[PDB]
Amino acid sequence: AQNPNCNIMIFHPTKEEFNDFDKYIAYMESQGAHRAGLAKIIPPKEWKARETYDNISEILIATPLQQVASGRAGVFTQYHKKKKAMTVGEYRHLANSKKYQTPPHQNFEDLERKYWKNRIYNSPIYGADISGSLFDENTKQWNLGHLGTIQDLLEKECGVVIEGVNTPYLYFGMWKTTFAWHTEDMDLYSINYLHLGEPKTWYVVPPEHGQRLERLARELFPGSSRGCGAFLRHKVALISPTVLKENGIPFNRITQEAGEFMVTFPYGYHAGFNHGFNCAEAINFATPRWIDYGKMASQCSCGEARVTFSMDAFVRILQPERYDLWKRGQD
Ligand SMILES: O=C(O)CNC(=O)C(=O)O
Ligand SMILES: [Mg+2]
Ligand code: NI
Numbered sequence: 001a002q003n004p005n006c007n008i009m010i011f012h013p014t015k016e017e018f019n020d021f022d023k024y025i026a027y028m029e030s031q032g033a034h035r036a037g038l039a040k041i042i043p044p045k046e047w048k049a050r051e052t053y054d055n056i057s058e059i060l061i062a063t064p065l066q067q068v069a070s071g072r073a074g075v076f077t078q079y080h081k082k083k084k085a086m087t088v089g090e091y092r093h094l095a096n097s098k099k100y101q102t103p104p105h106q107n108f109e110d111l112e113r114k115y116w117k118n119r120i121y122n123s124p125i126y127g128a129d130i131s132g133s134l135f136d137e138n139t140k141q142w143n144l145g146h147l148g149t150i151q152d153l154l155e156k157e158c159g160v161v162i163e164g165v166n167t168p169y170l171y172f173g174m175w176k177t178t179f180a181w182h183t184e185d186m187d188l189y190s191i192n193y194l195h196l197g198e199p200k201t202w203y204v205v206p207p208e209h210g211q212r213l214e215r216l217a218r219e220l221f222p223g224s225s226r227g228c229g230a231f232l233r234h235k236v237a238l239i240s241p242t243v244l245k246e247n248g249i250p251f252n253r254i255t256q257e258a259g260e261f262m263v264t265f266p267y268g269y270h271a272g273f274n275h276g277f278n279c280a281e282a283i284n285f286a287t288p289r290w291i292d293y294g295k296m297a298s299q300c301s302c303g304e305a306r307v308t309f310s311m312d313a314f315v316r317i318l319q320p321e322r323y324d325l326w327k328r329g330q331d
């Protein structure tokens with residue numbers, strides 16, 4: 001078995017190997033990459049996402065989210081308070097202000113220590129989940145707006161044509177902005193490209209051990225667990241690496257820098273934080289190996305998780321027994 005310790009693997013495809021996205025994902029899996037739940041892909045030196053980032057300041061963040069924490073430093077939830085709209089230029093200036101800017105630090109480890117010590121005492125503003133793309137239309141390799149759609153994959157694997165679309169999303173971050181522990185909708189893959197700015201640190205639990213994280217989360221968030229049998233779908237709970245180590249949960253960590261892709265694999269729980277002002281683009285995707293994960297994915301039916309239009313068909317076709325309850329949650 002390849003990668004039996006479930007380490008995060010880093011890949012350096014050549015420009016030739018960067019042509020066929022599906023083939024390269026299958027290659028990475030042949031080497032055991034999925035066992036970690038997360039992989040890094042460093043593009044060939046010849047590749048670029050677009051020519052410059054000079055003209056992005058007029059993108060609108062219609063609903064910036066202030067991420068307010070409750071709990072203790074290593075075990076907390078966050079809620080998202082909606083803020084007035086602002087442009088990317090306005091948000092960048094805010095991120096760089098004394099109130100929100102990255103503190104002085106020695107290296108990524110020192111910054112990680114400061115994050116876990118102090119996150120809860122601040123409420124950073126995240127421009128998350130903005131439909132759109134920063135890939136130039138002429139970028140033909142690993143252009144996250146030109147991937148094969150998940151509806152087409154389901155159709156190719158299962159023979160059933162379904163409604164829905166699959167488009168990318170932009171994330172504008174600042175110091176301390178946080179993504180809570182989660183797997184993707186329907187335990188899909190994700191791919192994330194850091195277009196510009198400061199790094200993003202990731203934490204990930206191997207898919208084969210995801211249920212250990214869920215059991216700890218039920219213990220640490222006992223009200224939330226009673227509320228919903230899949231409350232990590234709410235994407236609000238944070239657990240630090242120190243707490244994970246104290247409870248014997250297997251995990252790994254890695255820091256993504258500008259110009260790098262990350263891939264999350266089906267049922268790979270992940271969480272993390274931004275180091276400073278940045279912009280990422282991410283999208284879900286599927287492969288043949290996803291199908292069985294999609295069939296077994298948990299679902300939130302309490303009403304909190306509320307998701308996209310396109311999830312309906314995935315539940316309806318892959319999980320018909322759960323469909324009625326799940327849809328009641330959506331309505
Ligand atoms: O970048 C973020 O805030 C969160 N991204 C992801 O969870 C992802 O790409 O799967
Ligand atoms: Mg602009
Ligand atoms: Ni994710």
Ligand SMILES: [Zn+2]
Pocket residue numbers: 227228229230231233234300301302303304305
């Ligand atoms: Zn729920």
